[PDB]
Amino acid sequence: SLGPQVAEGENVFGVCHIFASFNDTFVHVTDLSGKETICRVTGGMKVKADRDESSPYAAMLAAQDVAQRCKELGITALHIKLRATGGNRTKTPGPGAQSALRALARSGMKIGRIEDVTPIPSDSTRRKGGRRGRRL
Amino acid sequence: PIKLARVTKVIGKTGSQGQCTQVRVEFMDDTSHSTIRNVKGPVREGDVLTLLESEREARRL
Amino acid sequence: VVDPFSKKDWYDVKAPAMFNIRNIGKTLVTRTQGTKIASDGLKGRVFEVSLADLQNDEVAFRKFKLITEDVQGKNCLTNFHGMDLTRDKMCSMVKKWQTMIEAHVDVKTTDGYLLRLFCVGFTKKRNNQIRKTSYAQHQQVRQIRKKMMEIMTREVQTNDLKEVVNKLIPDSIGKDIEKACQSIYPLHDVFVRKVKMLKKPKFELGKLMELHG
Amino acid sequence: TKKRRNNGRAKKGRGHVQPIRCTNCARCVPKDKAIKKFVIRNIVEAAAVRDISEASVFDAYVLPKLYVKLHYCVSCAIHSKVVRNRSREARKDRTPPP
RNA sequence: GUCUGGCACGGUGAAGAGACAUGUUUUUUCACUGACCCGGUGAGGCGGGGGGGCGAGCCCCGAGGGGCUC
RNA sequence: AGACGGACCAGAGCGAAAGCAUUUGCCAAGAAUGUUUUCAUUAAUCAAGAACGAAAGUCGGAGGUUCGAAGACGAUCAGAUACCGUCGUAGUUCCGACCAUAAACGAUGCCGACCGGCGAUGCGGCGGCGUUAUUCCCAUGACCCGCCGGGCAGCUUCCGGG
Numbered sequence: 034s035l036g037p038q039v040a041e042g043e044n045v046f047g048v049c050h051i052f053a054s055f056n057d058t059f060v061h062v063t064d065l066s067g068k069e070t071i072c073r074v075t076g077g078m079k080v081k082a083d084r085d086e087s088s089p090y091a092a093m094l095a096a097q098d099v100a101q102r103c104k105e106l107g108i109t110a111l112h113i114k115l116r117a118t119g120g121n122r123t124k125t126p127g128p129g130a131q132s133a134l135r136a137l138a139r140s141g142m143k144i145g146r147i148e149d150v151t152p153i154p155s156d157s158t159r160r161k162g163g164r165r166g167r168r169l
Numbered sequence: 170p171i172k173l174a175r176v177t178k179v180i181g182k183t184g185s186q187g188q189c190t191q192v193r194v195e196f197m198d199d200t201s202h203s204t205i206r207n208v209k210g211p212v213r214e215g216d217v218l219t220l221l222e223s224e225r226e227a228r229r230l
Numbered sequence: 231v232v233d234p235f236s237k238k239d240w241y242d243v244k245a246p247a248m249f250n251i252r253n254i255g256k257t258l259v260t261r262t263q264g265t266k267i268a269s270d271g272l273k274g275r276v277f278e279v280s281l282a283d284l285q286n287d288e289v290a291f292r293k294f295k296l297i298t299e300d301v302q303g304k305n306c307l308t309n310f311h312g313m314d315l316t317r318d319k320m321c322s323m324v325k326k327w328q329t330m331i332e333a334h335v336d337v338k339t340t341d342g343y344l345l346r347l348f349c350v351g352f353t354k355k356r357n358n359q360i361r362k363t364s365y366a367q368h369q370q371v372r373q374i375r376k377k378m379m380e381i382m383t384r385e386v387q388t389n390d391l392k393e394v395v396n397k398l399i400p401d402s403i404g405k406d407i408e409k410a411c412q413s414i415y416p417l418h419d420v421f422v423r424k425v426k427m428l429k430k431p432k433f434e435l436g437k438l439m440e441l442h443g
Numbered sequence: 444t445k446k447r448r449n450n451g452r453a454k455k456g457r458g459h460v461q462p463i464r465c466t467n468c469a470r471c472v473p474k475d476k477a478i479k480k481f482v483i484r485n486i487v488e489a490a491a492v493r494d495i496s497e498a499s500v501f502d503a504y505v506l507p508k509l510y511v512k513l514h515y516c517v518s519c520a521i522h523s524k525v526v527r528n529r530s531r532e533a534r535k536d537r538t539p540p541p
Numbered sequence: 542g543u544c545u546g547g548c549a550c551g552g553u554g555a556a557g558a559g560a561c562a563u564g565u566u567u568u569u570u571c572a573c574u575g576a577c578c579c580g581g582u583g584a585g586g587c588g589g590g591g592g593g594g595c596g597a598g599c600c601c602c603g604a605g606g607g608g609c610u611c
Numbered sequence: 612a613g614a615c616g617g618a619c620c621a622g623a624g625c626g627a628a629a630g631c632a633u634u635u636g637c638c639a640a641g642a643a644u645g646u647u648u649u650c651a652u653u654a655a656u657c658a659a660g661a662a663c664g665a666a667a668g669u670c671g672g673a674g675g676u677u678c679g680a681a682g683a684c685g686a687u688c689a690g691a692u693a694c695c696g697u698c699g700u701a702g703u704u705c706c707g708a709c710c711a712u713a714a715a716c717g718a719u720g721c722c723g724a725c726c727g728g729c730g731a732u733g734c735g736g737c738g739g740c741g742u743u744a745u746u747c748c749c750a751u752g753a754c755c756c757g758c759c760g761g762g763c764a765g766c767u768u769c770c771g772g773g
């Protein structure tokens with residue numbers, strides 16, 4: 034009896050918590066509180082090599098797996114919360130965010146309230162690299 | 170999840186040598202839904218494809 | 231191996247009576263095994279949720295926090311914990327070739343609730359204006375910060391948190407701060423941002439229920 | 444040979460200025476050099492828009508944007524093909540394009 | 542000499558879980574004090590209570606009372 | 612727990628220069644403007660001499676998140692005791708004394724006069740139609756339109772030079 038409030042229209046909310054960046058991509062479904070977790074998934078658990086972890090393909094596969102494990106419990110709707118590395122890094126999303134999100138919708142998960150969440154430090158510590166940066 | 174699609178218009182060549190080409194397509198089962206894809210070989214407006222990865226949403230190469 | 235979810239229980243969360251829609255989404259807890267009781271491990275979660283979905287006649291760019299405090303019969307009755315604004319809006323307001331003003335304060339309401347308030351305002355461009363800039367001088371700004379702190383203290387040292395939230399929802403604090411300062415500079419855009427709650431008294435159950443009844 | 448009159452940096456009457464750090468390069472440059480740029484992009488990028496708005500829960504859901512300030516080096520910029528070199532007389536235009 | 546396990550000095554109560562086999566003791570945790578130990582003092586005003594009242598704020602309130610916090 | 616003070620931040624302001632950015636309070640200085648106040652040539656530039664002087668660095672205490680010369684490893688390479696990645700000492704932080712250098716650049720000594728225009732910006736003073744202001748009409752900015760001073764800069768030219 035997983036959410037036994039049976040009305041066939043009482044949508045059950047969760048949140049997704051996408052953390053996208055370079056070299057990785059995470060999809061971490063939780064409840065309204067973020068304290069209880071449901072099938073955290075990545076991009077590295079699907080592909081073989083290490084230089085194709087952060088591809089939209091591995092992102093798409095992850096959401097399809099998550100959506101499967103999520104519809105097996107009565108969770109129907111979601112709220113989306115997006116994140117970049119932040120701190121003193123790029124603080125722009127990576128190339129796995131677009132692909133993952135779209136694959137949830139077209140799989141069917143009745144989403145609302147997509148928003149961003151990212152640190153944005155006011156004037157925090159000194160960044161790595163050393164005054165001339167990486168001189169490739 | 171094998172699919173079909175007809176072609177609407179050709180955009181431009183691409184690739185390191187001008188062998189692939191950009192196109193726009195509708196899926197022959199719903200008319201509103203649409204994507205753009207890379208193909209190889211002589212392709213004209215008025216054609217039909219056998220798509221396997223139903224969604225890629227490719228860009229400039 | 232056994233799936234670790236079969237031994238769990240879906241409960242419900244419940245909001246106070248100041249809000250029209252009192253019924254929100256659900257949560258889940260684990261059952262009771264010796265120590266580590268459900269209600270104890272359930273006490274203290276914080277359900278960030280918007281304000282449109284509580285009222286459906288109100289703005290969307292606000293958030294309330296709504297900690298839980300007590301439980302009775304698979305329904306978690308909450309209390310106020312905090313307020314917060316939304317970032318898309320905040321970054322939208324911050325524009326260029328104008329001036330930004332900020333202020334804050336600490337005050338203790340009638341009860342023992344101590345809380346720290348924050349405010350913000352932006353200067354305006356008159357509709358016939360050409361000079362592109364619309365900056366201010368430092369002096370008259372000091373007046374405005376001073377004027378903010380007066381208004382908040384006046385409003386908050388009089389009431390205990392049922393009145394105060396009913397001001398916050400249609401934020402009249404800032405609509406009045408707008409009205410005051412328009413004889414110095416206009417300040418078209420004004421808000422109360424953040425209402426973190428620094429200290430709280432003990433748990434008086436009778437107070438909670440009659441608020442939540 | 445002064446290639447420029449500004450000397451490349453809009454100081455004109457200070458003495459000293461604070462630095463910043465390139466968002467890619469990671470190097471330490473002043474705030475009057477160090478090309479600026481401002482992003483007001485959406486989040487879904489013109490492709491999945493129809494899919495979301497049909498699979499929503501709300502009614503048409505205005506769908507927020509994303510805001511960023513960007514700093515670039517001079518070196519990292521030209522390699523990114525933001526700006527380009529110019530000829531002698533056209534260096535003296537302080538206008539951006541449409 | 543020193544580390545460590547066990548029996549005795551070793552008492553009161555409450556929760557959780559066991560091996561046998563269909564209760565036994567066991568145990569981990571919380572609390573108590575009366576054995577035991579420690580410090581201070583010329584063993585000098587401890588706890589409840591209302592005879593307290595100089596006052597305050599919370600209730601009923603004959604505005605005069607007593608109830609609560611001090 | 613210790614550092615840092617984002618976006619607002621501008622060919623905008625201040626300071627002898629080095630250099631200066633969260634709130635508030637205190638302490639003592641200063642430019643410009645305004646002036647039918649005052650003293651009456653008291654001044655400009657300056658060998659010797661004297662104050663201040665980024666970063667690194669040295670000395671004695673307190674502290675030690677982040678970054679990271681040295682230093683050790685893993686890769687690329689014909690070789691790399693470098694460019695890359697992971698760790699990581701001195702130092703980076705505050706209090707008190709030393710040193711006195713830089714593309715310390717406007718690569719342009721200070722004082723004073725004269726010599727062409729135009730539209731702006733920042734401070735102060737003088738005025739004028741009008742709009743708002745605020746709470747019933749005034750003195751506050753805000754613009755609207757001009758002027759005057761002394762400032763940071765800018766566009767244009769057969770002034771004239773080179």
Ligand SMILES: [Mg+2]
Pocket residue numbers: 458459
């Ligand atoms: Mg300098």
Ligand SMILES: [Mg+2]
Pocket residue numbers: none
């Ligand atoms: Mg000399």
Ligand SMILES: [Mg+2]
Pocket residue numbers: 666
């Ligand atoms: Mg130094």
Ligand SMILES: [Mg+2]
Pocket residue numbers: none
């Ligand atoms: Mg030093």
Ligand SMILES: [Mg+2]
Pocket residue numbers: none
């Ligand atoms: Mg030392």
Ligand SMILES: [Mg+2]
Pocket residue numbers: none
């Ligand atoms: Mg390191």
Ligand SMILES: [Mg+2]
Pocket residue numbers: none
């Ligand atoms: Mg020298």
Ligand SMILES: [Mg+2]
Pocket residue numbers: none
């Ligand atoms: Mg020189």
